[PDB]
Every structure is written in C-alpha cells, then in structure tokens.
Design goal:
Elements: H1 11-14, H2 20-23, H3 29-41, E1 50-55, E2 58-64, E3 75-76, H4 77-89, H5 93-107, E4 125-128, E5 134-138, H6 143-160, H7 168-182, H8 206-215, H9 219-243, E6 277-278, H10 285-295, H11 300-318, E7 329-330, E8 333-334, H12 342-351, H13 358-369, H14 379-392
Antiparallel strand pairs: 1-2, 3-4, 4-5, 6-7, 7-8
Helix pairs in contact: 3-14, 4-5, 4-6, 4-14, 6-7, 6-8, 8-9, 10-11, 10-12, 12-13, 12-14
Protein name: cellulase
Keywords: Carbohydrate metabolism, Cellulose degradation, Glycosidase, Hydrolase, Polysaccharide degradation, Signal, Xylan degradation
Disulfide bonds: 324-339
C-alpha cells in the first residue's frame, strides 16, 4: 500500500522512516540495496564506480570514477561525497574512509591558496595524468559535494565514532565552516563563489541544514543552519511557485536567482546550458523535495512540487513517439536529448515520498524498480543516483544524530 498521504511530521523527528519499495509491494529489497552497493563497490568494471588509487604502486585511497565516454574519465567531488554518503548509510566504514582519505588529500584546496574564495574548498574536477597520478583539472567547488561531504561526515561520526583513523566529527565541522565561509550568500548556497544572486535549485537540501543544526553544539551555529534551512525551503517553494504552469510547466530549472526566478538564458561564460532548462541538475530537485518531505515532513508545497513535476513528465510520455519523457525540457518543450535514463527515473522514484497520487506513484516507481542497475559509459551519474535512490526507496537514508 503506497502511502498517498505522507506525514507532515518528518522521519527525522519521529524516528519512523518510510520504506517506499515495501509500500509499493516489492520484495528482496535489502538484497537489491545491498547488491546495489556491492556491485557499485565491487571490482568489476561494470556497475563499479569505486576505484582504488595507487601512487607508484603503493595504495593510497579510493575515489568515485566519473566515467566519461565522450570527454574521457575524471574525478568529481559530488560523486565522491555521494559515495561516502551511501557508505555510511550501509554501514560500510572501510569504503567510507577510503573515499574520505582521497577527498581530504587530493580534492581539498590548501587554506593558504592564493585565491581566498578557493581556500579549503574542494576542487571539483580531478583527472588522472598518463603518468599515473591525480591532479586538479578544476580548482573551483561543486558546493553540493561539500554539502554532502559535511552531511556524510556528521553521520559517519554519529555511527562509528571519531576514535578511528578519521575524526569525522571535526572533519565535519571544518566542512560546515567552509560552506558557511565559501559557499553561501545570504545563507543561500552559491552556484559558485564568483557569481552573485545565483543558486542551483538542485543544491538545496533543506533537511540537511536542519540536520547540521542539530549536530552543532553552540547556540549561535544552531541558529545559522536552522536559518539556512528556513531560507532553503522558502527558495524551493518560491522556485516551484515560479515554475507553475505556463511558461515552465512545473519542472524546476538549472539555475535560479535567490528570489526563486529561473535564470533565463546564459548569464556567464562556460554555463553549459541556459538557466531555465530542466536538465541534469534540475533532475534532482524533486528528488531533494522527496528526501525533505520524508525527513522533515511534507508541507503542501512539497506535494504540489513533486506531483505537478511528475505529472508533466507523465503527460509528456504520451506527447512522445518513443513513448517516454525526455532528458531535457525547456519552457515545457522537449529539447530532444533522448529518453530519460536510469538516474532521472531514480530521481523521480524518490520524489514519490512527497507525492500523493498513488496511481502516479505506481507509474513512476515500477519504472525505477524494474530497471537493472546502471552499467556502461553513462553509468556514473545514473548509477550514483540509482544508489542514492536505492537507499531512499528502501528506508535506508537516515539521519544519524551525534550525542554530546
């Protein structure tokens, strides 16, 4: 029985986590969740994304391989912090520290970096030189990584304690301070440290902030993060209000102004796509809403947000000869980028945690649950979200609080 009226109390306060998959009637879920991790983390160059990093043949750490069939493989912070996240969620501590060692060592920018805006942040692109070593391809942050880096670490601490190799809890504070100091603007997460009145809706994870707050001890910082959470929901609320119907047709967008306006067209050099596109990043907004609705409780905006989004994708599936919804949508029109992949389907599966239309829910869930785990060239992004979505639909994405 899908629970078509999600609690306005969150899983976080109540300690009651939903098991979407279970509700949807499914079976052997934990197996899937586990096999999912196991494959993603097993040496098989198939679903695998977890790769060991050796230097002169002395093992160092592990990293998540952002597998690139076009531009050629690189190493991004996002997928790394995701790795750490899944690890801690599945009590895989061996793997966790492997990835965190890598991150702390190779992704991190020295705090004596000439550029202050780059200091202690995490280089978003790293690559493997033909010689065999890691180096920074791009020294600018992907603030979402640091976001999850912090979240992953707070949990790691709470789960395993900080007497091991890594003092997760301190590592976590540093990160949190970094985000405050290098990745914010009026408490709204930057799309970059260099542009202003700019955010990426897909970075907002209101519940994470609330969580951060409960895991910082001093009364000043509790407020900071509680504020950031308030503003973040507000942001998504507004953003979602703004995308309602014409001209946007209820799909969130790549970039946003802090008021929640979709950034129309190009506004800076390098910008892959126009800001008003529902694309690879925007894929995650309703996924984040679900997560939020689940953990922090479902308000109406949540419900409307996921529903209408999902609705359009549903409605669009009929508007198509190839009988699917597409990867990119501008002003409600198909940008012809092929049919939705596993990661996009995975995203929408989580979104159902705020959904209320049970019919819809079955449409979207059975579509994700039927997929086989991402393999091949485009498997980095899809597999990463597949893994996250696996924890989400299985009652395995939990907030683990530290006690003081």
């Amino acid at each position: 029985a899908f629970n078509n009226n999600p609690s306005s109390v969150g899983a976080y306060s109540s300690g009651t986590y939903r098991n979407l998959a279970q509700e949807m009637g499914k079976t052997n879920i934990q197996q899937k969740v586990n096999s999912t991790f196991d494959n993603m983390f097993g040496y098989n160059n198939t679903q695998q994304l977890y790769y060991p990093y050796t230097e002169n043949g002395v093992y160092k750490a592990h990293y998540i391989k952002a597998i690139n069939p076009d531009e050629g493989d690189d190493i991004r912070t996002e997928g790394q912090s995701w790795g750490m996240t899944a690890a801690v969620m599945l009590n895989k501590q061996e793997e966790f520290d492997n990835l965190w060692r890598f991150a702390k060592a190779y992704q991190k920018n020295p705090d004596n970096h000439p550029d202050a805006k780059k200091q202690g942040v995490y280089a978003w692109k790293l690559k493997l030189n033909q010689n065999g070593f890691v180096y920074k391809v791009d020294e600018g942050p992907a603030p979402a990584g640091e976001e999850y880096f912090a979240f992953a670490l707070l949990n790691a601490s709470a789960r395993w304690g900080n007497s091991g190799e890594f003092n997760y809890y301190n590592d976590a504070i540093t990160m949190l301070n970094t985000i405050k100091n290098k990745l914010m603007e009026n408490q709204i997460i930057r799309f970059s440290p260099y542009i202003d009145n700019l955010t990426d809706p897909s970075y907002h994870i209101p519940a994470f902030y609330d969580y951060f707050a409960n895991n910082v001890t001093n009364q000043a910082d509790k407020n900071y993060w509680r504020q950031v959470a308030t503003k973040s929901r507000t942001l998504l609320k507004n953003h979602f209000t703004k995308v309602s119907g014409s001209p946007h047709w209820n799909l969130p967008t790549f970039l946003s102004r802090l008021d929640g306006s979709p950034v129309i067209g190009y506004i800076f050099n390098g910008q892959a796509n126009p800001g008003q596109w529902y694309e690879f990043d925007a894929w995650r907004v309703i996924m984040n809403v679900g997560l939020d609705a689940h953990l922090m409780g479902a308000q109406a905006w949540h419900k409307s947000a996921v529903n209408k989004a999902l609705g359009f994708l549903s409605y669009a599936k009929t508007n198509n000869s190839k009988n699917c919804y597409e990867q990119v949508y501008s002003y409600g029109g198909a940008q012809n980028r092929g049919c939705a992949g596993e990661g996009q389907k995975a995203a929408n599966a989580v979104a159902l945690l705020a959904s209320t239309n049970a019919g819809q829910a079955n449409e979207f869930f059975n579509e994700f649950w039927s997929l086989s785990q991402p393999t091949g060239d485009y498997r980095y992004y899809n597999g990463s979200l597949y893994m996250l979505a696996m924890l989400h639909v299985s009652g395995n994405f939990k907030f683990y609080n530290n006690t003081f």
